Amino acid sequence: SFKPTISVHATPQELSAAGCRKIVEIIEASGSQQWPLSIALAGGSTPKMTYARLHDEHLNLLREKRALRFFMGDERMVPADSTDSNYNMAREVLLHDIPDDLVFPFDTSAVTPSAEATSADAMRVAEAYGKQLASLLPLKSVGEAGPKVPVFDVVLLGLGSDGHTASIFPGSQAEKETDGKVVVSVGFPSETMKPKVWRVTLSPATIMQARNVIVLATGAEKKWVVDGILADTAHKAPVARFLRGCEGNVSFLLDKEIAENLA
Ligand SMILES: [Hg+2]
Ligand SMILES: [Hg+2]
Ligand SMILES: [Zn+2]
């Protein structure tokens, strides 16, 4: 049913190392003629190390060879120069060395420091990005004669302590957007997740059409999440369990603690 590739690593430096090679392998296996490949970036300290890795040893591939076109998988409705911005983090560690025409962040230019972003601001931003995606990437229907969503070559994902991924939180509308009518969803963090601001994020539908999905996660507090995704019959499962329905190649790069129970 679900046979994902799994690799357990002892340290973050090792997990990020596996992350770097994986991406590079996808780039090379795909071929120079398929470049630039579309990739949806994830935020967080784990992916950050992977991006630093790419910056230090593979700029000839990414910069000179222009192998990748960078998009954001989810973003915080804050200014692009905010420390809470996922794009800001990606630019700092890597994107600053990438040709400007290969970098596509969410247009959050309307968000000002004076006022918090609202649900409508988020939906407006998600809508504009979705159209841009449907314009730049190849489309595919979700189910026969189903709605069409853009197809990413690669989608990077993190995992949360509460069981979410990207900005698709428990009991949210985004969680049910699996039919393909919505390409880019919106979401607001639960009580225990930070920062407290509205988010825009790829819907579960879009994510499941990606050619390659790579989840980078660590920590003993996220162990039930991995277990709940891989488990054969999970009723009280985590939101991330929807990753079972992904149509492309699915990989899990984990650390020892989060994969302890792993059989
Ligand atoms: Hg690498
Ligand atoms: Hg997946
Ligand atoms: Zn640099």
XYZ file of N, CA and C and ligand atoms in Angstrom:
792
model
N 0.844 -1.228 0.000
C 0.000 0.000 0.000
C 0.864 1.258 0.000
N 1.590 1.468 1.095
C 2.453 2.636 1.244
C 3.869 2.191 1.603
N 4.770 2.237 0.626
C 6.158 1.827 0.841
C 7.114 2.989 0.607
N 7.216 3.901 1.581
C 8.114 5.045 1.425
C 9.572 4.710 1.734
N 10.476 5.528 1.210
C 11.896 5.348 1.457
C 12.161 6.007 2.803
N 12.839 5.294 3.695
C 13.136 5.835 5.010
C 14.620 5.727 5.334
N 15.166 6.773 5.938
C 16.566 6.766 6.329
C 16.673 7.448 7.689
N 17.281 6.750 8.644
C 17.453 7.268 9.997
C 18.876 7.779 10.141
N 19.031 8.921 10.800
C 20.345 9.521 10.969
C 20.613 9.890 12.424
N 21.869 9.745 12.838
C 22.284 10.019 14.212
C 22.313 11.489 14.615
N 22.673 12.368 13.687
C 22.752 13.790 14.001
C 22.078 14.659 12.945
N 21.896 15.955 13.252
C 21.265 16.862 12.295
C 22.176 17.045 11.091
N 23.478 17.128 11.341
C 24.433 17.286 10.254
C 24.352 16.108 9.287
N 23.986 14.935 9.801
C 23.870 13.753 8.952
C 22.536 13.765 8.212
N 21.483 14.187 8.903
C 20.165 14.243 8.285
C 20.187 15.252 7.139
N 20.763 16.428 7.382
C 20.838 17.458 6.348
C 21.717 16.985 5.200
N 22.735 16.192 5.520
C 23.623 15.676 4.487
C 22.816 14.772 3.560
N 21.985 13.920 4.144
C 21.154 13.026 3.348
C 20.170 13.864 2.536
N 19.727 14.973 3.122
C 18.786 15.845 2.440
C 19.396 16.445 1.194
N 20.635 16.908 1.317
C 21.350 17.512 0.196
C 21.547 16.536 -0.973
N 22.044 15.336 -0.682
C 22.275 14.355 -1.737
C 20.980 13.955 -2.444
N 19.918 13.780 -1.664
C 18.609 13.402 -2.185
C 18.181 14.386 -3.265
N 18.167 15.662 -2.903
C 17.787 16.706 -3.832
C 18.697 16.676 -5.060
N 20.009 16.635 -4.836
C 20.960 16.610 -5.948
C 20.718 15.399 -6.843
N 20.425 14.253 -6.237
C 20.168 13.047 -7.014
C 18.931 13.210 -7.886
N 17.924 13.911 -7.365
C 16.699 14.138 -8.118
C 17.023 15.027 -9.311
N 17.831 16.052 -9.062
C 18.240 16.988 -10.102
C 18.990 16.296 -11.246
N 19.942 15.444 -10.884
C 20.756 14.743 -11.870
C 19.976 13.651 -12.582
N 19.223 12.859 -11.822
C 18.428 11.782 -12.403
C 17.436 12.361 -13.406
N 16.882 13.524 -13.081
C 15.915 14.180 -13.957
C 16.548 14.607 -15.274
N 17.792 15.069 -15.210
C 18.469 15.487 -16.421
C 18.453 16.983 -16.663
N 19.544 17.466 -17.250
C 19.734 18.875 -17.568
C 18.633 19.424 -18.473
N 18.009 18.535 -19.235
C 16.964 18.942 -20.160
C 15.618 19.179 -19.485
N 15.511 18.779 -18.222
C 14.282 18.981 -17.466
C 14.434 20.177 -16.525
N 15.610 20.800 -16.546
C 15.865 21.953 -15.692
C 15.277 23.224 -16.300
N 14.848 24.171 -15.449
C 14.893 24.105 -13.984
C 13.732 23.318 -13.377
N 14.037 22.461 -12.410
C 12.999 21.677 -11.753
C 12.333 22.544 -10.686
N 11.025 22.377 -10.509
C 10.297 23.157 -9.515
C 10.424 22.530 -8.132
N 10.757 23.336 -7.128
C 10.872 22.817 -5.770
C 10.162 23.718 -4.763
N 9.356 23.114 -3.894
C 8.630 23.876 -2.872
C 9.387 23.756 -1.557
N 9.926 24.878 -1.095
C 10.703 24.925 0.142
C 9.882 24.966 1.421
N 10.434 24.349 2.458
C 9.818 24.308 3.774
C 10.663 25.165 4.715
N 10.043 25.637 5.794
C 10.762 26.451 6.757
C 11.243 25.569 7.888
N 11.929 26.152 8.867
C 12.409 25.369 9.990
C 13.913 25.158 10.023
N 14.435 24.906 11.217
C 15.864 24.700 11.416
C 16.438 23.496 10.664
N 15.656 22.429 10.534
C 16.137 21.246 9.827
C 16.388 21.542 8.344
N 15.355 21.997 7.611
C 15.574 22.290 6.190
C 16.662 23.342 5.981
N 16.784 24.257 6.937
C 17.782 25.317 6.858
C 19.184 24.745 6.654
N 19.510 23.704 7.409
C 20.824 23.078 7.303
C 21.014 22.444 5.932
N 19.925 21.951 5.354
C 19.993 21.336 4.035
C 20.286 22.423 3.004
N 19.649 23.579 3.171
C 19.858 24.681 2.247
C 21.291 25.203 2.362
N 21.823 25.261 3.582
C 23.194 25.734 3.794
C 24.154 24.795 3.063
N 23.829 23.509 3.104
C 24.619 22.480 2.446
C 24.656 22.742 0.940
N 23.490 23.035 0.374
C 23.385 23.298 -1.056
C 24.169 24.549 -1.433
N 24.102 25.558 -0.574
C 24.816 26.808 -0.808
C 26.334 26.605 -0.816
N 26.835 25.820 0.129
C 28.271 25.596 0.241
C 28.919 24.672 -0.783
N 28.207 23.650 -1.237
C 28.820 22.714 -2.168
C 28.165 22.526 -3.525
N 27.011 23.137 -3.764
C 26.363 22.906 -5.046
C 25.856 24.113 -5.814
N 26.492 25.263 -5.635
C 26.052 26.454 -6.353
C 26.291 26.372 -7.855
N 27.276 25.594 -8.290
C 27.529 25.492 -9.723
C 26.305 24.877 -10.380
N 25.710 23.918 -9.682
C 24.516 23.230 -10.156
C 23.320 24.180 -10.148
N 23.097 24.805 -8.998
C 21.970 25.710 -8.801
C 22.108 27.100 -9.408
N 23.295 27.685 -9.313
C 23.510 29.022 -9.849
C 23.925 29.024 -11.317
N 25.090 28.460 -11.616
C 25.571 28.408 -12.992
C 24.686 27.532 -13.885
N 24.360 26.332 -13.417
C 23.532 25.426 -14.204
C 22.030 25.701 -14.101
N 21.631 26.538 -13.147
C 20.217 26.873 -12.987
C 19.358 25.607 -13.005
N 19.671 24.654 -12.134
C 18.925 23.401 -12.097
C 17.562 23.491 -11.398
N 17.424 24.413 -10.444
C 16.176 24.560 -9.697
C 15.465 25.909 -9.760
N 14.140 25.842 -9.707
C 13.296 27.026 -9.680
C 12.692 26.918 -8.275
N 12.917 27.929 -7.439
C 12.449 27.898 -6.057
C 11.112 28.551 -5.719
N 10.246 27.764 -5.094
C 8.939 28.232 -4.651
C 8.860 27.934 -3.159
N 7.894 28.542 -2.475
C 7.708 28.308 -1.046
C 6.519 27.367 -0.847
N 6.679 26.367 0.019
C 5.608 25.421 0.306
C 4.579 26.031 1.250
N 5.045 26.881 2.157
C 4.158 27.603 3.066
C 4.917 28.829 3.546
N 4.182 29.838 4.001
C 4.798 31.075 4.435
C 3.985 31.753 5.520
N 4.651 32.603 6.295
C 4.007 33.356 7.365
C 3.619 34.716 6.792
N 2.412 35.172 7.114
C 1.925 36.459 6.625
C 2.576 37.615 7.372
N 3.875 37.773 7.139
C 4.670 38.829 7.751
C 5.521 39.405 6.629
N 6.202 40.530 6.879
C 7.028 41.096 5.810
C 8.130 40.117 5.399
N 8.583 40.230 4.152
C 9.626 39.351 3.630
C 10.959 39.483 4.368
N 11.149 40.587 5.085
C 12.393 40.809 5.815
C 12.225 40.496 7.295
N 11.092 39.893 7.642
C 10.810 39.523 9.025
C 11.567 38.249 9.389
N 11.961 38.131 10.652
C 12.683 36.948 11.096
C 11.734 35.756 11.162
N 10.441 36.039 11.032
C 9.406 35.011 11.060
C 9.072 34.522 9.647
N 9.675 35.156 8.648
C 9.453 34.789 7.251
C 10.285 33.574 6.841
N 9.655 32.592 6.200
C 10.378 31.406 5.745
C 11.263 31.789 4.565
N 10.769 32.692 3.724
C 11.527 33.140 2.563
C 12.794 33.864 3.021
N 12.640 34.724 4.024
C 13.765 35.464 4.572
C 14.872 34.483 4.960
N 14.499 33.426 5.668
C 15.460 32.419 6.090
C 16.120 31.738 4.893
N 15.324 31.395 3.881
C 15.848 30.728 2.693
C 16.748 31.652 1.866
N 16.421 32.937 1.842
C 17.213 33.902 1.086
C 18.582 34.044 1.744
N 18.565 34.228 3.061
C 19.775 34.384 3.863
C 20.763 33.235 3.680
N 20.269 32.011 3.817
C 21.120 30.838 3.709
C 21.435 30.352 2.298
N 20.582 30.666 1.326
C 20.814 30.168 -0.027
C 20.350 30.989 -1.234
N 19.076 31.366 -1.246
C 18.517 32.079 -2.387
C 19.201 33.373 -2.831
N 19.978 33.999 -1.952
C 20.660 35.231 -2.338
C 21.626 34.989 -3.514
N 22.068 33.740 -3.676
C 22.992 33.360 -4.746
C 22.290 32.757 -5.959
N 20.961 32.789 -5.950
C 20.192 32.229 -7.049
C 19.655 33.305 -7.983
N 19.814 33.116 -9.301
C 19.311 34.110 -10.253
C 17.857 34.488 -9.921
N 17.610 35.791 -9.817
C 16.305 36.340 -9.478
C 15.100 35.773 -10.225
N 15.292 35.339 -11.466
C 14.183 34.796 -12.236
C 13.887 33.340 -11.893
N 14.584 32.811 -10.892
C 14.376 31.428 -10.469
C 13.917 31.371 -9.015
N 13.498 32.519 -8.491
C 13.053 32.624 -7.107
C 11.638 33.197 -7.063
N 10.713 32.426 -6.493
C 9.317 32.843 -6.410
C 8.729 32.785 -5.009
N 8.843 33.878 -4.258
C 8.284 33.867 -2.909
C 6.819 34.315 -2.964
N 6.108 34.202 -1.849
C 4.719 34.658 -1.812
C 4.776 36.178 -1.791
N 3.857 36.839 -2.486
C 3.858 38.292 -2.472
C 3.151 38.804 -1.225
N 3.931 39.051 -0.174
C 3.407 39.557 1.087
C 3.726 41.047 1.233
N 3.997 41.714 0.117
C 4.345 43.130 0.145
C 3.287 44.059 0.751
N 2.041 43.602 0.821
C 0.976 44.427 1.383
C 0.990 44.386 2.907
N 1.491 43.289 3.464
C 1.553 43.136 4.910
C 2.505 44.161 5.513
N 1.972 45.016 6.381
C 2.771 46.043 7.035
C 2.884 45.735 8.520
N 3.960 46.208 9.161
C 4.197 45.986 10.590
C 3.142 46.592 11.515
N 2.436 47.613 11.034
C 1.423 48.284 11.846
C 0.213 47.417 12.198
N -0.191 46.534 11.290
C -1.346 45.683 11.551
C -1.123 44.211 11.218
N -1.688 43.337 12.045
C -1.578 41.900 11.835
C -2.339 41.549 10.563
N -1.935 40.464 9.910
C -2.596 40.024 8.693
C -3.856 39.274 9.094
N -4.895 39.376 8.274
C -6.147 38.689 8.576
C -6.360 37.527 7.627
N -7.447 36.803 7.868
C -7.845 35.675 7.050
C -7.971 36.088 5.585
N -8.603 37.233 5.346
C -8.791 37.714 3.982
C -7.472 38.082 3.307
N -6.526 38.640 4.066
C -5.229 39.002 3.487
C -4.537 37.726 3.035
N -4.600 36.703 3.882
C -3.985 35.416 3.592
C -4.604 34.778 2.353
N -5.935 34.794 2.285
C -6.638 34.208 1.151
C -6.319 34.929 -0.156
N -6.129 36.237 -0.077
C -5.795 37.025 -1.255
C -4.405 36.597 -1.763
N -3.461 36.472 -0.839
C -2.091 36.078 -1.169
C -2.035 34.652 -1.712
N -2.805 33.758 -1.101
C -2.838 32.366 -1.530
C -3.416 32.258 -2.934
N -4.444 33.053 -3.200
C -5.103 33.059 -4.500
C -4.161 33.526 -5.610
N -3.422 34.602 -5.354
C -2.497 35.133 -6.353
C -1.354 34.156 -6.659
N -0.834 33.505 -5.620
C 0.260 32.545 -5.780
C -0.229 31.301 -6.526
N -1.449 30.869 -6.214
C -2.012 29.703 -6.871
C -2.103 29.901 -8.371
N -2.547 31.084 -8.787
C -2.656 31.380 -10.209
C -1.272 31.394 -10.840
N -0.299 31.946 -10.123
C 1.057 31.996 -10.653
C 1.556 30.566 -10.859
N 1.269 29.696 -9.897
C 1.678 28.298 -10.001
C 1.021 27.599 -11.195
N -0.286 27.793 -11.364
C -1.015 27.162 -12.466
C -0.531 27.675 -13.812
N 0.207 28.775 -13.779
C 0.738 29.377 -14.986
C 2.158 28.912 -15.323
N 2.960 28.657 -14.298
C 4.352 28.242 -14.485
C 4.618 26.737 -14.515
N 3.795 25.968 -13.812
C 3.998 24.528 -13.732
C 2.993 23.711 -14.524
N 3.354 22.461 -14.865
C 2.440 21.599 -15.618
C 1.278 21.225 -14.696
N 0.084 21.093 -15.266
C -1.098 20.761 -14.479
C -1.490 19.293 -14.547
N -2.196 18.842 -13.516
C -2.676 17.473 -13.457
C -3.969 17.403 -12.651
N -4.940 16.653 -13.158
C -6.218 16.518 -12.475
C -6.133 15.590 -11.264
N -6.834 15.951 -10.198
C -6.863 15.133 -8.991
C -8.042 14.186 -9.176
N -7.754 13.004 -9.718
C -8.785 12.022 -10.002
C -9.177 12.196 -11.461
N -9.740 11.163 -12.083
C -10.141 11.280 -13.482
C -11.179 12.382 -13.604
N -10.991 13.264 -14.579
C -11.911 14.375 -14.803
C -12.004 15.259 -13.566
N -10.962 15.226 -12.740
C -10.959 16.025 -11.529
C -10.325 17.390 -11.713
N -10.412 18.262 -10.702
C -9.828 19.606 -10.788
C -8.315 19.487 -10.981
N -7.720 20.463 -11.659
C -6.285 20.445 -11.935
C -5.435 21.276 -10.982
N -4.310 20.708 -10.567
C -3.391 21.412 -9.681
C -1.990 21.362 -10.294
N -1.138 22.340 -9.957
C 0.220 22.344 -10.507
C 1.018 21.165 -9.950
N 1.922 20.634 -10.765
C 2.746 19.501 -10.362
C 4.173 19.960 -10.066
N 4.583 19.786 -8.817
C 5.923 20.157 -8.382
C 6.875 18.985 -8.594
N 8.130 19.266 -8.919
C 9.078 18.170 -9.072
C 9.437 17.709 -7.670
N 9.624 18.671 -6.775
C 9.977 18.363 -5.401
C 9.268 19.244 -4.379
N 8.775 18.610 -3.317
C 8.127 19.311 -2.214
C 8.784 18.863 -0.908
N 9.347 19.820 -0.177
C 10.001 19.548 1.099
C 9.006 19.816 2.221
N 8.956 18.912 3.189
C 8.034 19.063 4.301
C 8.672 18.838 5.656
N 8.119 19.522 6.648
C 8.558 19.369 8.017
C 7.394 18.645 8.673
N 7.467 18.436 9.982
C 6.423 17.743 10.719
C 6.313 18.416 12.083
N 5.088 18.594 12.563
C 4.896 19.248 13.841
C 4.568 18.308 14.979
N 4.796 18.795 16.193
C 4.543 18.040 17.413
C 3.072 17.648 17.553
N 2.190 18.491 17.026
C 0.753 18.238 17.095
C 0.281 17.348 15.948
N 1.186 17.045 15.022
C 0.825 16.183 13.909
C 0.598 16.868 12.575
N 0.802 18.178 12.521
C 0.607 18.884 11.265
C 1.878 18.840 10.424
N 1.769 19.371 9.210
C 2.877 19.475 8.274
C 2.601 20.801 7.561
N 3.633 21.437 7.015
C 3.453 22.731 6.354
C 2.618 23.591 7.310
N 1.580 24.247 6.808
C 0.723 25.037 7.688
C -0.700 24.483 7.672
N -0.793 23.162 7.546
C -2.069 22.451 7.521
C -2.334 21.895 8.918
N -2.990 22.694 9.753
C -3.267 22.298 11.125
C -4.509 21.447 11.355
N -4.570 20.762 12.511
C -5.707 19.904 12.859
C -7.046 20.636 12.829
N -8.068 19.952 12.322
C -9.403 20.522 12.255
C -9.573 21.768 11.405
N -8.572 22.084 10.587
C -8.637 23.259 9.730
C -9.286 22.931 8.389
N -9.697 23.970 7.674
C -10.308 23.798 6.361
C -9.246 23.178 5.446
N -8.038 23.743 5.493
C -6.914 23.274 4.677
C -6.762 21.760 4.721
N -6.992 21.178 5.893
C -6.877 19.740 6.058
C -7.816 18.960 5.139
N -8.993 19.515 4.865
C -9.961 18.823 4.017
C -9.853 19.161 2.531
N -8.966 20.086 2.181
C -8.811 20.471 0.783
C -7.924 19.470 0.052
N -8.501 18.287 -0.155
C -7.842 17.163 -0.803
C -8.387 16.838 -2.199
N -9.466 17.503 -2.608
C -10.071 17.226 -3.911
C -9.470 17.964 -5.103
N -8.642 18.969 -4.841
C -8.024 19.687 -5.940
C -8.663 21.003 -6.330
N -9.786 21.355 -5.710
C -10.430 22.622 -6.041
C -9.619 23.802 -5.512
N -8.822 23.559 -4.475
C -7.980 24.602 -3.885
C -6.498 24.210 -3.990
N -5.701 25.002 -4.711
C -4.278 24.695 -4.860
C -3.441 25.235 -3.707
N -3.756 26.440 -3.253
C -3.037 27.050 -2.139
C -4.033 27.389 -1.019
N -3.841 26.776 0.148
C -4.712 26.990 1.304
C -4.189 28.082 2.237
N -4.935 28.335 3.308
C -4.549 29.315 4.318
C -4.714 28.607 5.656
N -4.087 29.126 6.704
C -4.225 28.478 7.994
C -3.702 29.306 9.141
N -4.233 29.056 10.333
C -3.791 29.773 11.522
C -3.356 28.739 12.559
N -2.166 28.919 13.141
C -1.647 27.978 14.137
C -2.516 27.747 15.366
N -2.373 26.558 15.937
C -3.091 26.187 17.141
C -2.420 26.899 18.312
N -3.088 26.851 19.458
C -2.625 27.464 20.696
C -1.139 27.250 21.002
N -0.678 26.019 20.823
C 0.705 25.645 21.122
C 1.756 25.823 20.020
N 1.435 26.278 18.883
C 2.375 26.457 17.773
C 2.651 27.943 17.527
N 3.840 28.259 17.200
C 4.267 29.642 16.963
C 4.929 29.792 15.590
N 4.964 31.018 15.039
C 4.437 32.275 15.579
C 2.935 32.406 15.337
N 2.279 33.233 16.140
C 0.841 33.435 16.005
C 0.473 34.425 14.909
N 0.496 33.962 13.664
C 0.137 34.787 12.516
C -0.452 33.867 11.461
N -1.275 34.427 10.581
C -1.886 33.645 9.517
C -0.838 33.120 8.539
N -1.115 31.950 7.972
C -0.207 31.302 7.032
C -0.887 30.965 5.709
N -0.079 30.877 4.654
C -0.548 30.463 3.341
C 0.230 29.164 3.148
N -0.369 28.185 2.482
C 0.300 26.903 2.320
C -0.275 26.065 1.193
N 0.558 25.210 0.609
C 0.080 24.341 -0.454
C -0.986 23.449 0.184
N -2.036 23.141 -0.564
C -3.094 22.297 -0.032
C -2.645 20.845 -0.081
N -3.334 19.960 0.658
C -2.968 18.544 0.646
C -3.068 17.986 -0.776
N -3.996 18.534 -1.557
C -4.197 18.094 -2.933
C -2.961 18.350 -3.799
N -2.434 19.564 -3.730
C -1.265 19.921 -4.518
C -0.072 19.058 -4.127
N 0.145 18.920 -2.824
C 1.246 18.133 -2.290
C 1.218 16.688 -2.771
N 0.028 16.109 -2.859
C -0.088 14.726 -3.287
C 0.126 14.465 -4.778
N 0.247 15.525 -5.570
C 0.506 15.378 -7.001
C 1.993 15.607 -7.322
N 2.769 16.024 -6.327
C 4.198 16.277 -6.536
C 4.943 14.995 -6.924
N 5.942 15.129 -7.793
C 6.701 13.968 -8.244
C 7.588 13.381 -7.154
N 8.026 14.226 -6.229
C 8.886 13.792 -5.129
C 8.578 14.612 -3.882
N 8.310 13.915 -2.786
C 7.995 14.553 -1.519
C 8.984 14.050 -0.478
N 9.659 14.982 0.180
C 10.650 14.628 1.182
C 10.319 15.267 2.521
N 10.104 14.428 3.527
C 9.792 14.908 4.866
C 11.052 14.855 5.726
N 11.417 15.987 6.323
C 12.593 16.080 7.194
C 12.062 16.356 8.598
N 12.211 15.400 9.510
C 11.705 15.576 10.869
C 12.600 14.959 11.940
N 12.562 15.542 13.140
C 13.359 15.060 14.266
C 12.644 15.261 15.599
N 13.156 14.613 16.642
C 12.576 14.757 17.967
C 11.679 13.638 18.464
N 11.849 13.282 19.734
C 11.044 12.223 20.337
C 9.577 12.642 20.491
N 9.321 13.943 20.593
C 7.946 14.415 20.739
C 7.141 14.314 19.443
N 7.804 13.979 18.338
C 7.118 13.850 17.051
C 7.044 12.384 16.614
N 7.422 11.483 17.514
C 7.424 10.056 17.218
C 6.039 9.471 16.924
N 5.020 9.904 17.663
C 3.670 9.391 17.430
C 3.174 9.814 16.041
N 3.699 10.931 15.552
C 3.305 11.430 14.244
C 3.805 10.493 13.154
N 5.101 10.193 13.177
C 5.671 9.287 12.188
C 4.944 7.950 12.298
N 4.789 7.460 13.525
C 4.092 6.195 13.742
C 2.684 6.227 13.149
N 1.970 7.327 13.387
C 0.609 7.468 12.888
C 0.469 7.574 11.378
N 1.563 7.906 10.701
C 1.542 8.022 9.254
C 1.821 6.653 8.649
N 2.830 5.981 9.192
C 3.243 4.667 8.712
C 2.321 3.535 9.171
N 1.638 3.732 10.295
C 0.735 2.714 10.830
C -0.284 2.255 9.789
N -0.512 0.947 9.729
C -1.454 0.360 8.777
C -2.895 0.817 8.985
N -3.359 0.787 10.226
C -4.718 1.202 10.546
C -4.729 2.247 11.658
N -4.706 3.516 11.272
C -4.699 4.603 12.244
C -5.985 5.426 12.219
N -6.771 5.315 13.287
C -8.023 6.054 13.405
C -7.734 7.432 13.998
N -7.140 7.439 15.187
C -6.792 8.677 15.873
C -5.437 9.107 15.316
N -5.361 9.178 13.992
C -4.133 9.535 13.295
C -3.840 11.029 13.223
N -2.595 11.386 12.870
C -2.197 12.790 12.759
C -2.612 13.329 11.398
N -2.673 14.649 11.286
C -3.036 15.291 10.032
C -2.116 14.841 8.893
N -0.828 14.715 9.199
C 0.172 14.330 8.213
C -0.078 12.966 7.583
N -1.013 12.205 8.137
C -1.295 10.891 7.580
C -1.770 10.986 6.129
N -2.245 12.158 5.720
C -2.713 12.309 4.345
C -1.568 12.095 3.357
N -0.328 12.152 3.846
C 0.836 11.949 2.980
C 0.859 10.541 2.401
N -0.010 9.677 2.916
C -0.113 8.311 2.417
C -0.680 8.328 1.005
N -1.531 9.312 0.732
C -2.151 9.420 -0.577
C -1.293 10.061 -1.655
N -0.086 10.496 -1.302
C 0.797 11.117 -2.286
C 1.070 10.155 -3.434
N 1.037 10.688 -4.650
C 1.238 9.912 -5.862
C 2.689 9.767 -6.316
N 3.575 10.618 -5.812
C 4.967 10.545 -6.223
C 5.860 9.749 -5.290
N 7.170 9.900 -5.457
C 8.138 9.210 -4.615
C 8.179 9.921 -3.258
N 7.888 9.182 -2.189
C 7.876 9.733 -0.832
C 9.064 9.257 0.014
N 9.787 10.208 0.599
C 10.952 9.897 1.426
C 10.871 10.539 2.812
N 11.383 9.830 3.816
C 11.409 10.319 5.196
C 12.841 10.329 5.718
N 13.373 11.517 5.987
C 14.721 11.652 6.530
C 14.511 12.029 7.993
N 14.777 11.074 8.883
C 14.558 11.251 10.316
C 15.806 11.061 11.166
N 15.719 11.485 12.423
C 16.827 11.313 13.347
C 16.467 10.131 14.247
N 17.435 9.661 15.025
C 17.245 8.515 15.908
C 16.050 8.590 16.858
N 15.937 9.675 17.617
C 14.836 9.801 18.572
C 13.442 9.688 17.971
N 13.211 10.361 16.852
C 11.895 10.324 16.232
C 11.595 8.981 15.579
N 12.637 8.208 15.281
C 12.452 6.915 14.634
C 12.675 5.715 15.552
N 12.780 5.965 16.853
C 13.002 4.892 17.818
C 12.077 3.692 17.608
N 10.772 3.920 17.726
C 9.786 2.854 17.570
C 9.751 2.260 16.166
N 10.333 2.973 15.208
C 10.351 2.526 13.820
C 10.762 1.062 13.683
N 9.916 0.284 13.015
C 10.176 -1.132 12.797
C 10.804 -1.351 11.421
Hg 24.767 16.975 -1.535
Hg 3.915 12.318 0.966
Zn 26.370 32.987 -0.686
